[PDB]
Design a protein around this ligand. Structure first.
Ligand SMILES: *[C@@H]1O[C@H](CO)[C@@H](O[C@@H]2O[C@H](CO)[C@@H](O[C@H]3O[C@H](CO)[C@@H](O)[C@H](O)[C@@H]3O)[C@H](O)[C@H]2NC(C)=O)[C@H](O)[C@H]1NC(C)=O
Ligand SMILES: *[C@@H]1O[C@H](CO)[C@@H](O)[C@H](O)[C@H]1NC(C)=O
Ligand SMILES: [K+]
Ligand SMILES: [K+]
Ligand SMILES: [Mg+2]
Lengths: 185, 645, 504, 100, 107
């Protein structure tokens, strides 16, 4: 089977630079320790404006993740989470960027759980990921769990069940649930 | 006093890549620009796309690639038009512009297997989901099967995500059912006011054994034509073998949807080697005259039904040709492809449509404009000549009446049509102009189109214009823009514009230059031209036999099918008995029916130029906004015409 | 903007997929067998429907043959959810009722919900585009609450309904999104006169078992009113147990003790729990009757109290039927000023649109300058801006008609208006007095192209949420020093609108 | 025995969409039956039909035996006991129609 | 052997139905079979004749129920071409209804 892995990081100002560094480094480790067959990686940084830091084509041609992740900055915008997702499903999972049909499609949403200024809601874009069939792993950060409505924003983003998908970034055993879900898949 | 210019479509479609072009004429330094899209009214920042800076290294040009996000905002029942405020900030200067927006996400194309079905049959239909660029998109659609009454008798809600733009469907037709024209309506989830339709007939029938073609020699009836109504009857079996039978032909007249039968006209005619000739004799028609009104008859049409019976006895076929116009004029002239506005003292290029009375083009017809005794021209196979007339430099409205000069026709017959063309108003009527000239011939992707920039002004200013900035608007979007450098003194420059597959089937091209003219005022002159492109697919699809074993097929014979086409492309098939079509051929899917809707979808309103340089952009469907204060008037209507659609 | 602590409706992923059956699957058993058993594990998705999913299967091997299986049960649910209960055969253009039941299976935690009936242009609801309809409620653990919602099916066919309920100081939200069939009547033959000029210019080349009189009256001495019902049966012999479903005008509750007083009443009974239910969200009441009479009026009445203050109030609803038969029911809606309790809509030959949004664009703001005045006049939406004089007035129950005298066409739009012309502007009856409008007065007015009632030339005008109207006095009525400021901005609005025209 | 139009519709992701020109295909034999049966009929309502033998052989008339088979749901002269046959001679390039 | 997805249906619903063809030895075969769909009246409003070899005795089928249709007890009769007296049946009900939310059991 075909392992298509996408990565969506928040860059909003609410992301303190230390949270942000953890994100970039955790992603790079996620890919690194996901060194395994037939896995493809693409990334976009999301805030109030979006910019895909690498596509799948650019990844099959460049396997070194550290080379892909170093140049990434913070955006310091607003937080258009909902809009970011249609940018993931409509662009990253397009055949034009490398997307293969009948592949295991996973989205890694890495944010603190605070959408703001987004004109789009979730009731259009979440059922979209499900009608397209993308299994959504969410990685909350900093104080993504201090508040109540943030952490539920996460389960709102994460596919069900959220206990199996919602994880903190510093936790090192966020991969093994998925690293393993493929070993006989 | 630096000038900042921004340009975008007259209408902004949601969930689609639109482009915005940025230029900074003659302003020093790397110049940053930030554009943001705001609700109208307020500071909602619907979109603020990426950072861009216009460098002298790049001659102060960059563009903005952006897609408008939706926020579920429109109005049902009565429809009010939605708007957004675009905001451009060149460093400190802010240039703002209120733009219309449309919900329409893309296109949807309904294929049924065939045109006509019987009670108890399955209607197989596919639906074709494409974006504004005829590329696959995935949205939910709603499919309704609506009888002649209009009542949905089957409805569904389905998504096209990862179905490659094809939604194979079906619906089973009931034994007890209303006969007539049934519909298939579909529409994207996002944009329901935009309905896509196809009709199909439901009648109790059995396929025949032979087809009958009743076809008159010439497409109309000249009112004084001595020969009368001459018709060639072709009757043949479906495999290509000629039929033996008898024919029964009655005549009738058709007025809009009001039809008047001619019972004395019915004549029985033998069948001669699977072909025939038949005449409505001048002698036949006149006996028992009815509501003759010779002068009045022009403008109506005639229908003729033949009921053909085999010589063996098994199958009878009723065939009919309807819509036969009784003319004084073999033709009709229309100005539908003609610009309404001209550059005074410059050539005026007409695409007059010579039309045969049913709608078909006219082949090898000499035509000319009354007056200008100098020259006459000849119609192509399309019934169109590029009558290029010389304007006299003068601000009188130019009035043109086109007549045909087709030999072997009466001079009264010759078809005529009149229009009036109005001068491009110059700023204070300073009569500094721009003329775009480009040769109008069916342009194929891969051909090079030379673009001619004609500059008209005193020597005081001509050295100032040092490049021209050009723009190609296609299918409702800005496709390419750039600059062609100019050196002081060349009044005319040509851009060898190489034509690509994006340009299909046609496009308009606008362009402009800027300077600081009379009364210290920054001045911009622009001009626009519609260019048609060879109609075809972006890619290509060919079906031929895959067995170099030529032979004619046999019931139950095996066959190998060869499909040649673009790599990775998905191909859906269907094989229909040609015999079906003898009973119905309407709403059959064609590459043509694609393009005809598409061109309807265009936002441009005039084939050419406009009343003034503002009308250029508006008539083309474009917004220009500059830091100086010059910008396009506002567009509040979705449709163009003087009589609305 | 009172409280910031709820999940936005805009982010409430509803329940979407409710197939009555699915997974028609066909899968093949390729697995290396152990014990003589190939084992297959098909990871799938769980539909947005809360029910136990029964799974039935059949193994067709060509060697051993067919084999039915032991059905498999997958028990699906959430702690807190909704299910929505609708009819099937509803009729377009007829006001109806739905009921939404939120269940709470949390064992010890009560809940406070803000739930919105979601706006739909296919339905005449209370929910305009911009004016939400959010009801706030509380739930006892291990209990569910019935919420009524009366609507008008404005269109035909497969219409979906949505309701999104969000909670406070807790986690989940939910949303129901459920379709059904809407259909037409076709009569349009109500007491027609022989030639009523109903025809257009360009065409052409029901309670049969039950008597039910319900009237809600007011009280003598927050606010309390009387509910009155008056019922009978039409047949040869008296009928069996009849039932009443009664639902509360938004934020209403009956008088707990008069409720008790009535239940001891003859031929009547309401169990204790729906009778000692709490005043917190006591909202829907069911009363069962021993029998009902075919011989005369047996009425009933009792008190209702106002628990929460909102200006606009859903009609109450009362549905009565014989114990055995629901489908031959009779439903009435009540409202004290709305006769027969029906929402205001606007109707022509077979079309209607919902007239229930704010009467006109909100007045009395601190800002009345030219700056905002022009901005709402320079918007593209403004099709027409006229200045007329209130000439005639048709007042009626349905709507109240103001006959306006256009002398000048300030800015025509998609309208073909001649000079010295008389045109019909409408205002709903609920709005009439709020407008403080008098004849003989000039008015400078504006609206949109969408706000035109009819087709040409037998047209009318409608004052909507965003229509702007303002009276214009005479020359002898603006010379006052007090009235300067008004007539000042009138003169400068006009001239700068006139000279400059519209900007674009 | 006829001529089919086969239509191919294709869409790639980048090469847009293309309905190709039709492809005709001609089912035609030397000898065959055209069998002229109504859409429906009424039960117990007797009519005839026609099975038209097409002798599209070149230069030889054709002595054929024409025949029907036994459906106990119809009353014709054919049985398993006794059949219902003519014996007919067809000139080349012609259409002989047998009544049943 | 006939499997319908549901036992009761709404007008305008899609009826999904499978047929299992086996001999008296209960083995999947591919053979020719006639399918007759009878309305409450009993009247076969659809028929079809297919063979299942290499479909493994499995005939997956589909029928669109008309919006205007007589409600009531519908049947599915089907038989081998060769043995018409040997007819096998299944019913299914057509009525306008809504799925309930709880069940009621009387004992
Ligand atoms: C907006 O900017 C885009 C990139 O900044 C630009 O895209 C470029 O579009 C041109 C179209 O002319 C393409 O140019 C050439 O591509 C190949 C290159 O070998 C040639 O064979 C062609 O003939 C063609 O001239 C670029 O490939 C394309 N590049 C990218 C990265 O998109 C848009 O054209 C710009 N549009 C506007 C309106 O400014
Ligand atoms: C019939 O007339 C009454 C008023 O007399 C009105 O309330 C009702 O809406 C009308 N019904 C129809 C179907 O027009
Ligand atoms: K045939
Ligand atoms: K249920
Ligand atoms: Mg932030």
């Amino acid at each position: 089977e075909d392992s298509d892995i996408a990565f969506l990081i928040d860059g909003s100002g609410s992301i303190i630079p230390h949270d942000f560094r953890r994100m970039k480094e955790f992603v790079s480790t996620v890919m690194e320790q996901l060194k395994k067959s037939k896995t493809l990686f693409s990334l976009m940084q999301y805030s109030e404006e979006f910019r895909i830091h690498f596509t799948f084509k650019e990844f099959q041609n460049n396997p070194n993740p550290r080379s892909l992740v170093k140049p990434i900055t913070q955006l310091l915008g607003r937080t258009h989470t909902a809009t970011g997702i249609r940018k993931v499903v409509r662009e990253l999972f397009n055949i034009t960027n490398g997307a293969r049909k009948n592949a295991f499609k996973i989205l890694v949403v890495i944010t603190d759980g605070e959408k703001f200024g987004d004109p789009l809601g979730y009731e259009d874009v979440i059922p979209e990921a499900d009608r397209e069939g993308v299994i959504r792993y969410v990685i909350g950060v900093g104080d993504a769990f201090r508040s109540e409505k943030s952490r539920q924003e996460l389960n709102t983003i994460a596919s069900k069940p959220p206990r199996d998908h919602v994880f903190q970034v510093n936790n090192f055993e966020a991969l093994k649930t998925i690293q393993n879900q493929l070993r006989e898949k | 006093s630096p000038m900042y210019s921004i340009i975008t479509p007259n209408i902004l479609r949601l969930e689609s890549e639109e482009t915005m072009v940025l230029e900074a004429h003659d302003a020093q330094g790397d110049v940053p620009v930030t554009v943001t899209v705001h609700d109208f009214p307020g500071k909602k920042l619907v979109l603020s796309s990426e950072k861009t800076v216009l460098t002298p290294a790049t001659n102060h040009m960059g563009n903005v690639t952006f897609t408008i996000p939706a926020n579920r905002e429109f109005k049902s029942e009565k429809g009010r038009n939605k708007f957004v405020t675009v905001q451009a900030t060149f460093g400190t200067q802010v240039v703002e512009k209120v733009v219309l927006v449309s919900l329409q996400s893309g296109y949807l194309f309904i294929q049924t297997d065939k045109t006509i079905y019987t009670p108890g049959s399955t209607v197989l239909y596919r639906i074709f989901t494409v974006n504004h660029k005829l590329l696959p998109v995935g949205r939910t659609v709603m499919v309704n099967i609506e009888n002649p009454e209009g009542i949905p008798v089957k409805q569904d809600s389905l998504s096209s995500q990862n179905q490659l733009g094809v939604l194979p469907l079906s619906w089973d037709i009931p034994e007890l059912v209303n006969m007539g024209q049934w519909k298939i309506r579909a529409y994207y989830e996002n944009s329901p006011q935009q309905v896509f339709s196809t009709e199909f007939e439901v009648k109790e029938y059995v396929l025949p054994s032979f087809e009958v073609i009743v076809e008159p020699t010439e497409k109309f009836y000249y009112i004084y034509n001595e020969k009368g109504l001459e018709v060639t009857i072709t009757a043949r079996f479906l495999y290509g073998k000629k039929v033996e039978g008898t024919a029964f032909v009655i005549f009738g007249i058709q007025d809009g949807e009001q039809r008047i039968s001619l019972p004395e006209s019915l004549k029985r005619i033998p069948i001669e080697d699977g072909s025939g000739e038949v005449v409505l004799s001048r002698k036949v028609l006149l006996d028992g005259v009815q509501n003759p009104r010779a002068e009045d008859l022009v403008g109506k049409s005639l229908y003729v039904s033949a009921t053909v019976i085999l010589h063996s006895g098994s199958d009878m076929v009723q065939a009919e040709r309807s819509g036969i116009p009784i003319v004084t004029s073999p033709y009709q002239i229309h100005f539908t492809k003609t610009p309404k506005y001209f550059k005074p003292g410059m050539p005026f290029d007409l695409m007059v449509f010579v039309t045969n009375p049913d709608g078909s083009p006219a082949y090898r017809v000499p035509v000319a404009v009354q007056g200008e005794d100098t020259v006459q021209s000849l119609t192509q196979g399309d019934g169109v000549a590029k009558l290029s007339i010389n304007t006299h430099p003068s601000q009188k409205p130019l009035s043109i009446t086109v007549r045909t000069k087709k030999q072997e026709l009466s001079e009264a017959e010759q078809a005529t049509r009149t229009m009036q063309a109005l001068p491009y108003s110059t700023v204070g009527n300073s009569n500094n102009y721009l003329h775009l000239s480009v040769l109008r011939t069916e342009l194929r992707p891969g051909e090079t189109l030379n673009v001619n920039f004609l500059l008209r002004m005193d020597r005081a200013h001509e050295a100032k214009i040092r490049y021209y900035t050009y723009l190609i608007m296609n299918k409702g979007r800005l496709l390419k823009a750039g600059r062609q450098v100019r050196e002081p003194g060349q009044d005319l420059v040509v851009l060898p514009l190489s034509i690509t597959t994006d340009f299909i089937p046609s496009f308009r091209l606008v362009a402009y230059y800027t300077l600081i003219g009379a009364s210290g005022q920054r001045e911009v002159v622009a001009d626009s031209v519609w260019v048609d492109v060879k109609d075809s697919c972006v890619g290509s699809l060919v079906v031929k036999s895959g067995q170099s074993e030529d032979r004619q097929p046999v019931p139950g014979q095996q066959m190998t099918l060869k499909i040649e086409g673009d790599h990775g492309a998905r191909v859906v098939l269907v094989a229909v008995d040609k015999g079906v079509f003898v009973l119905n051929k309407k709403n059959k899917l064609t590459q043509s029916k694609i393009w005809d809707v598409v061109e309807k979808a265009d936002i441009g309103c005039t084939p050419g130029s406009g009343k003034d340089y503002a009308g250029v952009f508006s008539d083309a469907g474009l917004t220009f906004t500059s830091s100086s204060g010059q910008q396009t008037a506002q567009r509040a209507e979705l449709q163009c015409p003087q009589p609305a659609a | 903007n009172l409280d910031e602590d709820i999940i936005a409706e805009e982010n409430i992923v509803s329940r979407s997929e409710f197939p009555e059956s699915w997974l028609w699957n066909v899968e093949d058993l390729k697995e290396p067998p152990k014990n003589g058993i190939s084992t297959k594990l098909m990871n799938i998705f769980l539909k947005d429907s809360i029910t136990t999913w029964e799974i039935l299967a059949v193994s067709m091997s060509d060697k051993k043959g067919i084999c039915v299986a032991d059905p498999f049960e997958v028990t699906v649910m959430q702690d807190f959810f909704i299910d929505l209960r609708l009819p099937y055969s509803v009729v377009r253009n007829e006001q109806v009722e739905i009921r939404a039941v939120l269940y709470n299976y949390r064992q010890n935690q009560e809940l406070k919900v803000r739930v919105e009936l979601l706006h739909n242009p296919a339905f005449c609801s209370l929910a305009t585009t911009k004016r939400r309809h959010q009801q706030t409620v509380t739930i006892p653990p291990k209990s569910s609450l019935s919420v009524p919602y009366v609507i008008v099916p404005l269109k035909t066919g497969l219409q979906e309904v949505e309701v999104k309920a969000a909670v406070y100081h807790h986690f989940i939200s939910d949303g129901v999104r459920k379709s059904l069939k809407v259909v037409p009547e076709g009569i349009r033959m109500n007491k027609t006169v022989a030639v009523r000029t109903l025809d257009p210019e360009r065409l052409g080349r029901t309670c049969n078992k039950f008597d039910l009189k319900v009237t809600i009256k007011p009280a003598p001495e927050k606010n309390t009113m009387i509910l009155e019902i008056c019922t009978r049966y039409r047949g040869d012999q008296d009928a069996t147990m009849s039932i009443l479903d009664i639902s509360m005008m938004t934020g209403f509750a009956p008088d707990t003790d008069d409720l008790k007083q009535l239940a001891n009443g003859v031929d009547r009974y309401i169990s204790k729990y729906e009778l000692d239910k709490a005043f917190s969200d006591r909202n829907t009441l069911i009363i069962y009757l021993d029998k009902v009479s075919h011989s005369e009026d047996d009425c009933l009445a009792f008190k209702v109290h106002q628990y929460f203050n909102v200006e606009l109030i859903q009609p109450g609803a009362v549905k009565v039927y014989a114990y055995y038969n629901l489908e031959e029911s009779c439903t009435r809606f009540y409202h004290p000023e709305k006769e027969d309790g029906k929402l205001n809509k606007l109707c022509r030959d077979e079309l209607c649109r919902c007239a229930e949004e704010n009467c006109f664009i909100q007045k009395s703001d601190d800002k009345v300058t030219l700056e905002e005045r022009l901005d709402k006049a320079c918007e593209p939406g403004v099709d027409y801006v006229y200045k007329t004089r209130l000439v005639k007035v048709q007042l009626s129950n349905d709507f109240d008609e103001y006959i306006m005298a256009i002398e000048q066409t300030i800015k025509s739009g998609s309208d073909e208006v001649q000079v010295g012309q008389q045109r019909t502007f409408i205002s709903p009856i609920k709005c009439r007095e709020a407008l403080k409008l008098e004849e003989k007065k000039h008015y400078l007015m504006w609206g949109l192209s969408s706000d035109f009632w009819g087709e040409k030339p037998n047209l009318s005008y409608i004052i909507g949420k965003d229509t702007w109207v303002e009276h214009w006095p005479e020359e002898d009525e603006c010379q006052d020093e007090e009235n300067q400021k008004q007539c000042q901005d009138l003169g400068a609005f006009t001239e700068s609108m006139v000279v400059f025209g519209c900007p674009n």
